[PDB]
Design a protein around this ligand. Structure first.
Ligand SMILES: C=CCC(Cc1c(C)n(C(=O)OC(C)(C)C)c2ccccc12)(C(=O)OC)C(=O)OC
Length: 113
């Protein structure tokens, strides 16, 4: 698996766990590891550089959690701008899907001549 396929796959996973509920980095890492049957151990440094970019892009936002629960924990949430961009990707995949289906429908139904 090449470098940027892994980064894309990691981005798709992080945006989906936030799509389910706000979460903190250590919690995201454990939940992904147990949702991958232990195979996928995400790294904190790469998670923060992804989030730091997604913050300036307006895709996600950050806020400080409760301090009764230990002390000082940053939670991340998928914004409305992020929810809609995921919905468009959404639309775009099922749009590409039937464009491909239409290509061989049209490919063989014309190679007949
Ligand atoms: C649901 C939205 C995720 C997405 C776009 C996206 C990427 C990059 N996919 C991808 O490469 O899947 C691999 C090949 C399995 C790794 C997708 C695969 C299926 C559906 C959407 C995507 C995103 O993560 O880009 C930031 C988006 O548009 O979110 C706003």
């Amino acid at each position: 698996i090449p470098k940027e396929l892994l980064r894309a796959q990691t981005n798709v996973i992080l945006l989906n766990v936030l799509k389910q509920g706000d979460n903190y980095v250590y919690g995201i890492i454990k939940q992904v590891k147990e949702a991958s049957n232990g195979e996928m151990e995400l790294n904190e440094a790469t998670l923060y550089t992804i989030f730091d970019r997604l913050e300036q892009d307006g895709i996600i936002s950050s806020y400080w959690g409760d301090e009764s629960q230990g002390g000082r924990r940053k939670y991340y949430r998928l914004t409305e701008i992020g929810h809609e961009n995921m919905r468009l990707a959404x639309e775009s995949l099922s749009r590409v899907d039937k464009i491909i289906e239409n290509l061989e429908a049209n490919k063989k139904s014309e190679a007949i001549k």
